[PDB]
Design an enzyme around this catalytic site. Structure first.
Site, short mmCIF file in Angstrom:
data_model
loop_
_atom_site.label_atom_id
_atom_site.label_comp_id
_atom_site.label_asym_id
_atom_site.label_seq_id
_atom_site.Cartn_x
_atom_site.Cartn_y
_atom_site.Cartn_z
N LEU A 11 -2.83 -4.49 1.15
CA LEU A 11 -2.83 -3.10 1.56
C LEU A 11 -3.56 -2.24 0.54
O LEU A 11 -4.36 -1.39 0.90
CB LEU A 11 -1.38 -2.65 1.66
N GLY A 12 -3.25 -2.43 -0.71
CA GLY A 12 -4.06 -1.82 -1.75
C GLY A 12 -3.49 -2.20 -3.07
O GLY A 12 -2.55 -2.97 -3.12
N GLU A 13 -4.06 -1.64 -4.14
CA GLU A 13 -3.41 -1.66 -5.45
C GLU A 13 -3.01 -0.22 -5.82
O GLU A 13 -3.66 0.75 -5.40
CB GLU A 13 -4.31 -2.28 -6.52
N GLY A 14 -1.88 -0.10 -6.52
CA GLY A 14 -1.48 1.14 -7.21
C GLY A 14 -2.13 1.18 -8.59
O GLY A 14 -3.08 0.39 -8.88
N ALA A 15 -1.65 2.08 -9.46
CA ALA A 15 -2.05 2.00 -10.88
C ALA A 15 -1.69 0.58 -11.39
O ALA A 15 -2.58 -0.15 -11.87
CB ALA A 15 -1.39 3.09 -11.74
N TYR A 16 -0.44 0.17 -11.17
CA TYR A 16 0.07 -1.13 -11.62
C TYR A 16 0.32 -2.06 -10.41
O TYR A 16 0.99 -1.66 -9.46
CB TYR A 16 1.34 -0.90 -12.43
N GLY A 17 -0.26 -3.26 -10.43
CA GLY A 17 -0.01 -4.25 -9.38
C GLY A 17 -0.67 -4.08 -8.01
O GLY A 17 -1.56 -3.23 -7.82
N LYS A 34 5.52 -4.33 -2.78
CA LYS A 34 4.83 -4.35 -4.07
C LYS A 34 5.42 -5.49 -4.86
O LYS A 34 6.64 -5.49 -5.12
CB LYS A 34 5.01 -3.04 -4.87
N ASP A 121 -1.14 10.73 -9.95
CA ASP A 121 -2.31 10.04 -9.41
C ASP A 121 -2.51 10.37 -7.92
O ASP A 121 -2.69 9.49 -7.06
CB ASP A 121 -2.18 8.55 -9.66
C1 LIG Z 1 -5.07 -0.68 8.64
C2 LIG Z 1 -3.73 -0.86 7.99
C3 LIG Z 1 -3.49 0.03 6.80
N1 LIG Z 1 -2.09 0.24 6.47
C4 LIG Z 1 -1.74 0.65 5.18
C5 LIG Z 1 -0.45 0.82 4.78
C6 LIG Z 1 -0.19 1.09 3.46
C7 LIG Z 1 1.15 1.27 2.93
N2 LIG Z 1 2.21 1.36 3.73
N3 LIG Z 1 3.31 1.59 2.97
C8 LIG Z 1 2.98 1.64 1.65
C9 LIG Z 1 3.78 1.90 0.55
C10 LIG Z 1 3.13 1.92 -0.68
C11 LIG Z 1 1.74 1.72 -0.77
O1 LIG Z 1 1.17 1.79 -2.06
C12 LIG Z 1 -0.21 2.10 -2.18
C13 LIG Z 1 -0.53 3.49 -1.72
C14 LIG Z 1 -0.73 1.44 -3.39
C15 LIG Z 1 -1.22 1.03 -2.05
C16 LIG Z 1 0.95 1.50 0.33
C17 LIG Z 1 1.58 1.45 1.59
N4 LIG Z 1 -1.20 1.20 2.60
C18 LIG Z 1 -2.42 1.10 3.06
N5 LIG Z 1 -2.77 0.80 4.31
C19 LIG Z 1 -1.03 -0.05 7.46
C20 LIG Z 1 -1.46 -0.97 8.57
C21 LIG Z 1 -0.55 -0.91 9.78
O2 LIG Z 1 -2.76 -0.58 8.98
#
Ligand SMILES: C[C@@H]1CN(c2cc(-c3n[nH]c4ccc(OC5(C)CC5)cc34)ncn2)C[C@H](C)O1
Ligand SMILES: [Cl-]
Ligand SMILES: [Cl-]
Length: 262
Positions: A11-17, A34, A121
């Site tokens: 889904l992504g990276e934060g600052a950490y992990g 996470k 951030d």
């Molecule tokens: C396309 C795809 C993109 N998506 C997401 C979801 C999320 C996401 N959810 N909850 C989170 C809680 C913490 C979080 O910490 C970040 C912001 C460090 C990545 C991300 C998510 N982050 C990116 N993209 C959801 C699916 C259905 O669709």
């Protein structure tokens, strides 16, 4: 997480992990996880902050599982993905959509500030959207306490993301937390309205930042932005944090109060 979960994608990276889209092997419920191999002090801290949060524009925290050294942090999956992905490069997004997201951003930041937490951030990658396009502030890896027992503490550590950081963070040994988050919100607003960031960092050596200080708003990205929201950006992206607009005064701004959307 013994093996109740399937890791489906990053889904992504934060600052950490790193955070993963995990699908539960038993019920198929899809969450964000996470995963961190235990710093113990920091993750402890991240968890304590995550437990404080309860607001419609902050991402939901479900809980955590310690298993060996590795900690698992569970959160609501944002079915609408990130604000980053709604910004069309070099275009931005429609002004009424930007204003709604900015309202929601401000609601979430007021909530955090009100419980004495600074995010540190704020940027479109960390602003998530639910199925109704409500914005949720996510990633508490850099968050910290700035007010406790009604006494403010100054921040004394450089962190965040360079295009989003306020200038005082690069220049002062100690600085006030709130105006730094305000500034990053202005950079988010600029991104939404122009689909481009204004500078690599807000330093004297960066020409684009000098240009803004010299009021050259006939240049990009500013030239893309209507005069009303530009006037708000003029109050937010003020170099001296003591002269920068505060959230209560953002809430009084003309553009902020302009009716645009259904
Ligand atoms: C396309 C795809 C993109 N998506 C997401 C979801 C999320 C996401 N959810 N909850 C989170 C809680 C913490 C979080 O910490 C970040 C912001 C460090 C990545 C991300 C998510 N982050 C990116 N993209 C959801 C699916 C259905 O669709
Ligand atoms: Cl307190
Ligand atoms: Cl952008």
């Amino acid at each position: 997480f013994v093996e109740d979960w399937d890791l489906v994608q990053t889904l992504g990276e934060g600052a950490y992990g790193e955070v993963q889209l995990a699908v539960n092997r038993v019920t198929e419920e899809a969450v964000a996880v996470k995963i961190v191999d235990m710093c113990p002090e920091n993750i402890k801290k991240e968890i304590c902050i995550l437990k404080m949060l309860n607001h419609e524009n902050v991402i939901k925290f479900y809980g955590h599982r310690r298993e060996g050294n590795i900690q698992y942090l569970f959160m609501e999956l944002a079915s609408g993905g990130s604000l980053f992905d709604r910004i069309e490069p070099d275009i931005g997004m429609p002004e009424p959509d930007a204003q709604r997201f900015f309202h929601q951003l401000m609601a979430g930041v007021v909530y955090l500030h009100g419980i004495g937490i600074t995010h540190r951030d704020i940027k479109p990658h960390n602003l998530l959207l639910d199925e109704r396009d409500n914005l949720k502030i996510a990633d508490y890896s850099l968050a910290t306490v700035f007010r406790y027992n009604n006494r403010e503490r100054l921040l004394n550590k450089m962190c965040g993301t360079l295009p989003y950081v306020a200038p005082e963070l690069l220049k002062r040994r100690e600085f006030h937390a709130e105006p730094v988050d305000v500034w990053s919100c202005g950079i988010v607003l600029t991104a939404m309205l122009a689909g481009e960031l204004p500078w690599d960092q807000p330093s004297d050596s960066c020409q684009e930042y000098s240009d803004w200080k010299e009021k050259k708003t006939y240049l990009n990205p500013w030239k893309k932005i209507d005069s009303a929201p530009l006037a708000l950006l003029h109050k937010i992206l003020v170099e001296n944090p003591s002269a920068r607009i505060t959230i209560p005064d953002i809430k009084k701004d003309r553009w902020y109060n302009k009716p645009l959307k259904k």
